[PDB]
Design an enzyme around this catalytic site. Structure first.
Site, short mmCIF file in Angstrom:
data_model
loop_
_atom_site.label_atom_id
_atom_site.label_comp_id
_atom_site.label_asym_id
_atom_site.label_seq_id
_atom_site.Cartn_x
_atom_site.Cartn_y
_atom_site.Cartn_z
N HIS A 45 0.80 -1.21 0.00
CA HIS A 45 0.00 0.00 0.00
C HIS A 45 0.84 1.27 0.00
O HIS A 45 0.37 2.34 -0.44
CB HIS A 45 -1.06 -0.03 1.10
CG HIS A 45 -0.60 0.47 2.44
ND1 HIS A 45 -0.42 -0.38 3.53
CD2 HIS A 45 -0.35 1.73 2.90
CE1 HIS A 45 -0.05 0.34 4.59
NE2 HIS A 45 0.01 1.62 4.23
N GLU A 59 19.41 6.18 8.36
CA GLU A 59 18.70 7.39 8.76
C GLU A 59 18.26 7.32 10.23
O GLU A 59 17.82 6.27 10.70
CB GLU A 59 17.48 7.62 7.83
CG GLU A 59 16.65 8.90 8.16
CD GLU A 59 17.48 10.19 8.14
OE1 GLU A 59 18.36 10.39 8.97
OE2 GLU A 59 17.23 11.01 7.26
N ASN A 61 17.41 10.89 12.16
CA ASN A 61 16.58 12.07 12.28
C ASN A 61 16.21 12.56 10.90
O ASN A 61 17.09 12.89 10.08
CB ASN A 61 17.36 13.15 13.04
CG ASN A 61 16.49 14.35 13.44
OD1 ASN A 61 15.68 14.85 12.66
ND2 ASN A 61 16.74 14.88 14.64
N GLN A 64 17.43 16.39 10.30
CA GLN A 64 18.80 16.85 10.45
C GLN A 64 19.84 15.85 9.95
O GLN A 64 19.57 14.65 9.83
CB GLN A 64 19.07 17.32 11.88
CG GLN A 64 19.31 16.26 12.89
CD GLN A 64 19.35 16.81 14.33
OE1 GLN A 64 20.14 16.33 15.17
NE2 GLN A 64 18.50 17.80 14.62
N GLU A 69 23.71 8.83 6.61
CA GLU A 69 22.67 8.46 5.61
C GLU A 69 23.29 8.05 4.24
O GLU A 69 24.33 8.62 3.83
CB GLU A 69 21.72 9.65 5.39
CG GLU A 69 20.98 10.18 6.64
CD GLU A 69 21.72 11.33 7.30
OE1 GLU A 69 21.05 12.20 7.91
OE2 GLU A 69 22.97 11.35 7.21
N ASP A 93 -0.25 -7.44 1.73
CA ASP A 93 0.27 -6.04 1.80
C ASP A 93 1.79 -6.09 1.91
O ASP A 93 2.36 -5.90 3.01
CB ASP A 93 -0.38 -5.26 2.93
CG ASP A 93 -0.14 -3.76 2.83
OD1 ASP A 93 0.43 -3.33 1.79
OD2 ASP A 93 -0.54 -3.02 3.79
N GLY A 186 2.52 6.46 8.59
CA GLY A 186 3.93 6.76 8.37
C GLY A 186 4.84 5.62 8.87
O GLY A 186 6.04 5.56 8.50
N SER A 188 3.80 2.43 8.31
CA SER A 188 3.48 1.37 7.36
C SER A 188 4.70 0.96 6.57
O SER A 188 5.51 1.80 6.19
CB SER A 188 2.44 1.86 6.35
OG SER A 188 1.18 2.13 6.97
N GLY A 189 4.81 -0.34 6.32
CA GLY A 189 5.94 -0.84 5.53
C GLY A 189 7.17 -1.18 6.34
O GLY A 189 8.00 -2.00 5.88
CA LIG Z 1 18.98 12.53 8.90
#
Ligand SMILES: [Ca+2]
Length: 240
Positions: A45, A59, A61, A64, A69, A93, A186, A188-189
């Site tokens: 979805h 990741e 934050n 910032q 990352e 799903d 947010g 989800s997944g």
């Molecule tokens: Ca960051």
């Protein structure tokens, strides 16, 4: 994640942020689990919309520079062929994203360990949901990755009338339902990480919560059961 605590930077190195291009910037939309250096497992979805997606690994934050990352485009999206957008309760799903480049592994970027096919956890098994989803129902995304302790609720209980009834399938894992802690939009997944034989493995892909709200008593967060899809996952990676 509602009722979470901030995750330590190196606790959940397989967690990714799936983002979409929004004007001149990128917006977090879902979580995912890095499962190969060039494959991410997420929810079907999350990738129904015709958007441009990228994955961020390492990741912590969203708002910032963490100094850790790696940003990579999504090159191919393989949704489970039985997924139906108008029917999340049917299950299926789950989707795999092939990344445009292979990411580099380190303390912040590692492959998620998947359960063996068919594995079902005993009721009340210890698990954590992680993600940057809303920190309250109708709230806002987290800046920093959050975790919440969500013990499983087995199929018999989860599909009972006061819980989710017929809505929950045996291809799903339920967890939480305490009315305090939950996934929320947010998340989800992303992963549900469960401790089994001393090792955390990713038993769920966050799928849905109640239309009533995220943290609702006896409406535990529902996840696609990873161990129901091991053959499918292997087949997709093998053929792509
Ligand atoms: Ca960051």
């Amino acid at each position: 994640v509602v009722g979470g605590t901030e995750a330590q930077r190196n606790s959940w190195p397989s967690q990714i942020s799936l983002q979409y291009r929004s004007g001149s910037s990128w917006a977090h939309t879902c979580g995912g689990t890095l499962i190969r250096q060039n494959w991410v497992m997420t929810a079907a979805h999350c990738v129904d919309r015709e958007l441009t997606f990228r994955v961020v690994v390492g990741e912590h934050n969203l708002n910032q520079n963490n100094g850790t990352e790696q940003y990579v485009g999504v090159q191919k999206i393989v949704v489970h062929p039985y997924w139906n957008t108008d029917d999340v309760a049917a299950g299926y799903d789950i989707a795999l994203l092939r990344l445009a480049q292979s990411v580099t592994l380190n303390s912040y970027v590692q492959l998620g360990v998947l359960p063996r096919a068919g594995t079902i956890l005993a009721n009340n098994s210890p698990c954590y949901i992680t993600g940057w989803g809303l920190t309250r129902t109708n709230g806002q995304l987290a800046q920093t990755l959050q975790q919440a302790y969500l013990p499983t609720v087995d199929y018999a209980i989860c599909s009972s009338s006061s819980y989710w009834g017929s809505t929950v399938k045996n291809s799903m894992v339920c967890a939480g339902g305490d009315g305090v802690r939950s996934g929320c939009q947010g998340d989800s997944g992303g992963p549900l990480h469960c401790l089994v034989n001393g090792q955390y493995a990713v038993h769920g892909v966050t799928s849905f919560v109640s239309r009533l709200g995220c943290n609702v008593t006896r409406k535990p967060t529902v996840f696609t059961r990873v161990s129901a899809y091991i053959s499918w996952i292997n087949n997709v990676i093998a053929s792509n």
